[PDB]
């Protein structure tokens, strides 16, 4: 769904391909997230939004440090020549899949909730945001524990688009 | 072959093993079962889970046998004659499993007695365990 969550698809010389997860930890995962520009890597898995096709060729990552600015820049990455049948495809969910922010509030950790769906910042309907979701939002922004959930545009109506996802 | 210095080192090392021998043997059996699952085929009637009372009892028996061998280091074939007959004929344990158990015993002793597992003492204990295995695997056919 979002640009920074899902399987790692690779285009090399107009050839579609997907990364095999052998030798694929979180160190290589955050290199991809940094390459796409979405912070660090959260998990080598994603919540599926749409089906994708299957490609015969695979990208194999032997090992690389994890501080590289791009996946191609880290040493000895193999493109094709092996089958990822014994292993699985390499998935990733970067930190900007749903990055929250609080706007419109006159105090540091209060305001209208806005969540970035990869690159676009959009509001949230108060029927799609539970107390657990607000707790996760406050924890992620290092704002501690949630005090209240104020619906009906308490901090003013946002300008843009409203997301249609209920956070479970 | 066990030199007199090697016998001295083995006797000292097993003496400082002392009363912890039963749980040393239990840990060695657990390490053999986890690292080398092929040795579990010789224990189909045992509960092989971690912390098993049956595995702990068998480790106590193994360590008591090793204590008897240490005390009779000059007459080990006679000390282990019953065990030699048992393992070689009734159980038909293949000698590679004996070497695996010797390695796991050495690992247990290294992990539990790091100060006294000197390279000379490690070599002496390896020689003693090889002697035990050879005595127990001699009659194998």
């Amino acid at each position: 769904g979002s640009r920074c969550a899902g399987t790692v698809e690779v285009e090399i010389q107009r050839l579609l391909g997907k990364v095999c997860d052998r030798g694929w930890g979180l160190k290589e995962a955050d290199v991809v997230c940094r390459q796409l520009g979405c912070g660090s890597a959260l998990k080598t898995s994603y919540q599926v939004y749409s089906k994708i096709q299957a490609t015969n060729t695979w990208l194999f990552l032997s090992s690389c440090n994890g501080n590289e600015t791009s996946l191609w820049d880290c040493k000895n990455w193999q493109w094709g020549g092996l089958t990822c049948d014994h292993y699985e495809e390499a998935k990733i969910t970067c930190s900007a899949h749903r990055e929250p922010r609080l706007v419109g509030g006159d105090i540091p950790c209060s305001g209208r909730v806005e969540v970035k769906h990869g690159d676009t910042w959009g509001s949230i309907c108060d029927s799609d945001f539970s107390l657990e979701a607000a707790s996760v939002l406050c924890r992620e922004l290092q704002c501690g524990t949630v005090v209240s959930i104020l619906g009906g545009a308490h901090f003013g109506e946002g300008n843009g688009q409203i997301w249609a996802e209920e956070f479970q | 072959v066990l030199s007199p210095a090697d016998k001295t080192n083995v006797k000292a090392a097993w003496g400082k093993v002392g009363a912890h021998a039963g749980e040393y043997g239990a840990e060695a059996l657990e390490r053999m079962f986890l690292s080398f699952p092929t040795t579990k085929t010789y224990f189909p009637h045992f509960d092989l889970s971690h912390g098993s009372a049956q595995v702990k009892g068998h480790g106590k028996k193994v360590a008591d046998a090793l204590t008897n061998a240490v005390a009779h280091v000059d007459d080990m074939p006679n000390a282990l004659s019953a065990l030699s007959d048992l393992h070689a004929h009734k159980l038909r344990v293949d000698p590679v499993n004996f070497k695996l158990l010797s390695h796991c015993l050495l690992v247990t002793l290294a992990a539990h007695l790091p100060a006294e597992f000197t390279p000379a003492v490690h070599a002496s204990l390896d020689k003693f365990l090889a002697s035990v295995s050879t005595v127990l695997t001699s009659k194998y056919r």
Binding site: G23 | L34, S35, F36, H50, V107, H112
Partner: protein, 143 residues
């Protein structure tokens, strides 16, 4: 066989605290002491009769450092061990004529050294993981 992520994490965590400059030398010295026929290949390393001479040999320590670096290289590429150890296996098989069982003996001695160094931290699960690692290294370094 593929190594499980928990086993890989345990191996990496235990290897992070391994003294590269000393653990390899300790393992090589223990191999030369326990299995004296392995001293046949290191006749150019000087005195190797007394165990104290073997463990205190500077050449033995340097070669153990190199061996442990090769172990680390094979650890970083656990899924591709034959490819990473092709050159070393060819060296040992043709230039040095080292018996493949010596690699398994050195793996077992290295496991003993790790247990000796880490005490109870070398749990039976991480020992099983390291046994898989050293078996893969020896098989990739053999034939």
């Amino acid at each position: 066989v593929h190594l499980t992520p928990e086993e890989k994490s345990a191996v990496t965590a235990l290897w992070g605290k391994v003294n590269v400059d000393e653990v390899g030398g300790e393992a090589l010295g223990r191999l030369l002491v326990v299995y004296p026929w392995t001293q046949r290949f290191f006749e150019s390393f000087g005195d190797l009769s007394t165990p104290d001479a073997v463990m205190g040999n500077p050449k033995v320590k340097a070669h153990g450092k190199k061996v442990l670096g090769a172990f680390s290289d094979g650890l970083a590429h656990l899924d591709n061990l034959k490819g990473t150890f092709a050159t070393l296996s060819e060296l040992h098989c043709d230039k040095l004529h080292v018996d493949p069982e010596n690699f398994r003996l050195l793996g077992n001695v290295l496991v003993c050294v790790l247990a000796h160094h880490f005490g109870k931290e070398f749990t039976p699960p991480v020992q099983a993981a390291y046994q898989k690692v050293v078996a893969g290294v020896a098989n990739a370094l053999a034939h």
